């Protein structure tokens, strides 16, 4: 039980770090999607 609890707590810590970098990735993807839509409109006008 003690080993299971320690492994669970280590899993909580590493899973929180994984969540942290996961929404870091998600915020990066949202920012990229917005800036790519803006740049796609900008570059289509600039090519035309």
């Amino acid at each position: 039980i003690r080993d299971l609890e320690a492994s669970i707590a280590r899993y909580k810590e590493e899973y929180a770090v994984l969540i942290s970098e996961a929404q870091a990735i998600k915020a990066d993807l949202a920012a990229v999607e917005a800036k790519v839509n803006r740049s796609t409109a900008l570059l289509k006008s600039l090519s035309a």
């Binding site: 039980i1 299971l4 492994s7 669970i8 899993y11």
Partner: peptide, 11 residues
């Protein structure tokens, strides 16, 4: 976690 919870409930 599901396996660990099931094992804890069994024991």
């Amino acid at each position: 976690m599901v396996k660990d919870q099931q094992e804890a409930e069994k024991k």
